[model samples]
Target chain A: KNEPVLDIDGEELRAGEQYYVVSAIWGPGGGGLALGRLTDQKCPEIVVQRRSDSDYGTPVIFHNLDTKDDIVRLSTDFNVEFVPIRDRLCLTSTVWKIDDYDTSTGQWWVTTNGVIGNPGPQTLQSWFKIESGNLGYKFNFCPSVCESCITLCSDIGRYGNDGQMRLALAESGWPFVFKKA
Target chain B: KNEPVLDIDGEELRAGEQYYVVSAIWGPGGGGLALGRLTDQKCPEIVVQRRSDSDYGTPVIFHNLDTKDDIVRLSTDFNVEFVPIRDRLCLTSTVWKIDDYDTSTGQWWVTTNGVIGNPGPQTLQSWFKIESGNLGYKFNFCPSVCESCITLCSDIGRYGNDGQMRLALAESGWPFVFKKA
Candidate 1:
């Protein structure tokens, strides 16, 4: 029995609710960045970006897409699917519940093109979960869809891949708060 | 109508109550460090440090050390004074309500020795305030003590000079949450 995730204004965040996942801390060196799509290769991967001072990051919907409930909770499976707005080069799907785990860096790249509610073998890596963090909320990779599937379990954190900071599995998870779009 | 500053556990933080001003976020290199006293010159300045794994930061008492009341609030004058437990440099004034405005970097150098509220020209630069930010609570530098006295106003933030990150004036203030010590 955990409390529902709340937004910055102190309101409960609902499933399918469009929100901006922004960093809670402000720093001179890339602090206060927002989650966005970046091209790691042929696909547009999830990376922290800034469009403008007023514009934080791309708005995203947190959906289990399940009919059971709308209140998103900690330790529950959820989908950070969809990007009405995306990277300029992104000509594919924006769903993040799918990823290709990079063994070289042990980082999973989310979004080149992912779909919603598929839950197939390709989407097994796509299911992300939430947990309480020191600052706000932490996104983790522990999909329950494949009970027998040998999946990786790690915290979703900021990793400096090359020169760009991208969302990947790390020792510490990126702490974030949501702003209703 | 400012509300009393609440600790991480959702309780009101009272003046003279010993608490730890911990970074709301965690990282690999310098994230999760605690505030400790450091020797800059003949005086001990407040700097972020780590003693052990269990301890996050130094336990500090947030007090105006005032006579009017004990409730701490936002946009109010308060002292991050007194470190009952300090650094290896061994000593002088642990109070931070006093600082020397460095014209060289436009950064007010706090610590190295200063006392609690005497409100003289030396301590005119000491009074600090608090405000709400994108995250938790943010510490600011606007003092309300001397209305006629000219004081430098800015958000209290982290500035890395020559490698060591110390608390100084910056574009953004450090956001922190409290843990009752």
Candidate 2:
């Protein structure tokens, strides 16, 4: 079922259960928008394999079909702490926090820990958000500094020179899906 | 024993090589200041357990002693890419770049992403420098937040009521030590 099962606190499922976490964004391929990682060759779509161990705690593992590699994971090494701000889910890491740069425009990105990461009292901004509507989740990335979005023409199928792990957007708008694996 | 081994690029040693990571500031504890996570009780000090699988590509794992928990890991799920800006090391996460925010006079708080994690199209001011002086390499929280560093009495040791994890500075200024574990 596409309906998300939330606990009493309205959090996602706990550990020991496997769920296929798809992107809420629809891809050009007609499937859910998938997360990808940049390797030696190029970036590829990723599947979210979520595992929970306790209440209010879940770690997400990203996998690649062809490589069979666990490319990336979330809330694994650290607690993916969530904060409710204006009825929205705001995830906070040790040194960063997830925020929507332009809520009206549906643009989101992660903010860095100014004190620990940056210099001076001034804070900085970077990154962009590609999200899906229904699931209310997003994938964060650094759009090409030159363009609003990392266009398919220049960035797709290439590794980011700025040390960014590039992601590819499926041409067809794909919705993130969840399945009982 | 406290000497830090720097690679050719002046970064810390890769995985397998142990090094003591300290904060750039001196806390009340007389030891190096530290970064902590906000738990049910209070925030605790954080340790950086970094490992590298390839050259110049490393995953930094942040851990805490009391929790013995992996608080968060960099370059794991997303790449903890590093860039040299103005002869300084600027570490950037997937979508967020590090930055500093001045809470009050001398007191500073790390600002999470602003416009996604930076400022405007010009990119906000963020990122602190971890340098080796009389002490070892310290992870500077903010050099520009204010005149005095973020003090324990003012900014740390309390859980952020706003859902942000808060850290307290130990009065002793304890330096992060490394041993062959």
Candidate 3:
């Protein structure tokens, strides 16, 4: 039921047909680790709403992080879209932020709710899927605070010999292959 | 017919209009003198044709210049059409030369009919009608020998007056205006 039937060229699907194919799952929150320490302990929030006589749906708390600010603001302005170039799926987003610059003190202050690589507001998260099976998405907490956050694979020596799991989808030339339930 | 058509702002008719309403005509062929003296003794046969569709007519012999040794032939491959700018009628033509150059001797062995002035294949002749009924046209001769020709308005006692002559047109822009028909 998850698979949509497709034509020979992988286009023009014939109704009432089903097939088995691989699917990539992207969650709202994920963890990352660098230098044997957990980093980026924030889960992106997802809000659902109806279209017509719209009713607000449940707000899922995907991830949480300890911040100095009192209000835990969730970013929903920027949306993530997938682009297929060649045989790879690239995730892209358009987001904006305002940073504070103190010319007298020569100190720069990032505005509150400013994106630290939230991968939405003009930022994109993308990679190739080279793995299989259900993997638990984890967004870790790093010990550094900067204007932009970048998730990188490092030999943290904790999770086996391989680096942290990088999330990506395989381009199988079919729709709903990476759809969220 | 003598009055100029002025704009609402009291400005005369600008160039690029269908009709020019200016009341003055400058003289023609006044700038540079022709190299009639430098022409080879044996006159070169020049055949002028219309650039587009010579079916309209054959080429006319405009200039017959004499050179030594080789018989220099200057022929126009197309007709020259004069477009009117502000105070001038511009003539454009593509010239073709039939002559010879020598590699052995450091001299032009045969009479070589080369392009006359800076105008390569296509040359433009600009003319204006002076208020005295004398058609004043600026003949831009190309391939000017020694980059200098005759001068009309002289500081010295008329020693540098050029050999080129000015042509006149009938009052109402008739006769198509030629140098010496």
Top DockQ prediction, candidate number: 1
Candidate 2's TM-score reads: 0.20
Model 3, residue A5: distance off in Å is: 99
The lDDT for every candidate, in the order shown, is 0.64, 0.26, 0.21
Candidate 1: pairs in clash? A97-A126, A98-A126, B34-B57, B43-B112, B44-B112, B97-B126
lDDT of 2 by residue, A49-155 (tens): 12221111122322111122222222111112212122322222222222334353332322322122222112122222233331233343332324333322211
Best by lDDT: 1
Per-candidate TM-score, chain A: 0.82, 0.24, 0.16
Per-residue CA lDDT of model 3 for B1-181, tens digit only, reads 2333232233332222222111111111012111121233324322222222112222222222222212212221111222222232112231223223335332221112334333322322211111211121122223322224331210100111123221221123211212111
lDDT tens string, model 2, B1-181?
Answer: 1333343234544433323332221111122222322344231122212221111111222221112322221111111122112221122221212334435423334322212222222333232323343223233322232334442222122223233333323222212222211
Q: For each of the candidates, what fraction of the native contacts does it recover? A: 0.25, 0.00, 0.00
Candidate 3 or 1, higher DockQ: 1
The TM-scores, one per candidate, come to 0.50, 0.20, 0.13
For this target, which candidate reaches the highest TM-score against the unseen true structure? 1
| Residue lDDT tens for model 1, B78-128 | 667544565545455555643556676777655535555665455655567
Compose the digit string of candidate 3's lDDT tens values, residues A89-171. Answer: 12212111122334643322111122333333233222111111112111111212333655332111111212332211122
Which stretches in model 2 have alpha-carbon errors above 4 Å? A1-181, B1-11, B14-106, B111-125, B141-174, B177-181
Q: How many clashing residue pairs are found in candidate 1?
A: 6
